[PDB]
Design a binder for this molecule. Structure first.
Ligand SMILES: CCCCCCCC(=O)Nc1c(I)c(C(=O)O)c(I)c(C(=O)O)c1I
Ligand SMILES: CCCCCCCC(=O)Nc1c(I)c(C(=O)O)c(I)c(C(=O)O)c1I
Ligand SMILES: *C/C=C(C)/C=C/C=C(C)/C=C/C1=C(C)CCCC1(C)C
Ligand SMILES: CCCCCCCCCCCCCCCC
Ligand SMILES: CCCCCCCCCCCC
Ligand SMILES: CCCCCCCCCCCC
Ligand SMILES: CCCCCCCCCCCC
Ligand SMILES: CCCCCCCCCCCC
Ligand SMILES: CCCCCCCCCC
Ligand SMILES: CCCCCCCCCC
Ligand SMILES: CCCCCCCCCC
Ligand SMILES: CCCCCCCCC
Ligand SMILES: CCCCCCCCC
Ligand SMILES: CCCCCCC
Ligand SMILES: CCCCCCC
Length: 224
């Protein structure tokens, strides 16, 4: 498993991210700031667990398609199922989205992760991409709401909140956009990019989307 090295680096980075966020979060009195610490510390914690699992050889299965037996890390989806809605929740609390909007985003997010997982396990090569397409559409719905809906909500907040939302929004659009592409070209889809490089890419994306995101949010005045 040549990809072990990037599973190890991702473990170490998620672990350090979590530790740092926990230490800083434990020293914070502001009640608002605390909620953001709690949600955000959980994100790399969950990622650390799943990265550790995969490093130790769990959450990997073989799926036949295209006449080969292909290795699929399904533990990624167990991670993303819980971490992606928590990141959305961070953004929704920053802009005070309402409840129905939160429910719509969390549900689209569930569809995105669940259909992606189904696509990753599908044995008929062609139908894999049907699932991929549905998952991507759910994703684009989320991105639309974040870009159009949340930006409008953020503009009723003080500028320092609006500014922080924008940076986090822009990070999110750019980082989340790349995931369906990686999947399409990697070992789950077209099989062009081998598993090791793909594991590197998902590791860079995961650390950036979780620890990078967290560092921006948790160091800003916006959460106090
Ligand atoms: C791989 C992730 C790359 C995406 C970069 C996101 C940070 C950002 O929004 N930068 C930025 C900032 I900070 C700022 C800023 O300084 O507030 C602004 I204004 C803008 C803009 O709209 O031009 C931008 I773009
Ligand atoms: C990808 C990880 C690297 C990001 C490190 C900078 C994070 C940051 O919040 N910077 C920052 C600055 I510089 C500044 C600044 O201009 O000093 C401010 I004000 C805020 C804020 O409170 O909104 C923030 I958040
Ligand atoms: C920490 C992880 C983050 C922010 C992960 C985000 C992951 C996605 C946006 C994944 C999206 C996918 C698609 C849109 C289609 C193909 C399947 C996925 C699950 C890779
Ligand atoms: C008539 C208003 C609805 C228009 C629907 C747009 C559908 C396609 C959007 C998919 C892409 C959203 C990208 C988000 C920008 C970051
Ligand atoms: C109180 C705010 C700081 C973070 C709270 C902990 C949230 C759960 C993460 C525990 C990981 C070990
Ligand atoms: C008013 C809120 C409606 C929620 C819409 C969920 C959209 C699901 C994504 C479509 C993927 C096929
Ligand atoms: C294929 C992706 C569908 C995106 C459709 C956007 C729905 C409008 C919601 C309004 C929120 C700003
Ligand atoms: C079989 C090993 C050689 C192929 C290397 C493919 C790397 C493509 C990376 C594209 C990055 C997005
Ligand atoms: C063969 C070398 C094994 C080392 C494993 C270390 C991974 C943990 C992250 C620091
Ligand atoms: C600070 C890190 C807390 C997470 C430890 C949980 C380990 C679960 C093993 C799968
Ligand atoms: C496909 C790799 C995407 C590259 C962006 C990584 C930069 C992270 C800084 C927050
Ligand atoms: C001890 C700080 C850990 C943060 C990891 C940095 C990742 C930057 C993208
Ligand atoms: C969410 C609706 C599922 C439609 C899937 C069609 C299956 C084709 C293989
Ligand atoms: C070890 C470097 C981390 C800086 C945070 C304050 C100790
Ligand atoms: C990835 C860009 C970080 C900018 C932080 C400024 C608040």
């Amino acid at each position: 498993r040549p990809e072990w090295i990037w599973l190890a680096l991702g473990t170490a980075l998620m672990g350090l991210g979590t530790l740092y966020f926990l230490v800083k979060g434990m020293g914070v009195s502001d009640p608002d700031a605390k909620k953001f610490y709690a949600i955000t510390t959980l994100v790399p914690a969950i990622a650390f667990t799943m990265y550790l699992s995969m490093l130790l050889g769990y959450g990997l299965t073989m799926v036949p398609f295209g006449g080969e037996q292909n290795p699929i890390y399904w533990a990624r989806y167990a991670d993303w199922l819980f971490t992606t809605p928590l990141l959305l929740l961070d953004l929704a609390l920053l802009v005070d989205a309402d409840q129905g909007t939160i429910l719509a985003l969390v549900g689209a997010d569930g569809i995105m992760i669940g259909t992606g997982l189904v696509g990753a396990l599908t044995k008929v090569y062609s139908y894999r991409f049907v699932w991929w397409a549905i998952s991507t559409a759910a994703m684009l719905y989320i991105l639309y709401v974040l870009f159009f809906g949340f930006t409008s909500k953020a503009e009723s907040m003080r500028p320092e909140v609006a500014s922080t939302f924008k940076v986090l929004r822009n990070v999110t659009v750019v980082l989340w956009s790349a995931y369906p592409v990686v999947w399409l070209i990697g070992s789950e889809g077209a099989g062009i990019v081998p598993l090791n490089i793909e594991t590197l890419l998902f590791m860079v994306l995961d650390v950036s989307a979780k620890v990078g995101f967290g560092l921006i949010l948790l160091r800003s005045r916006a959460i106090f």
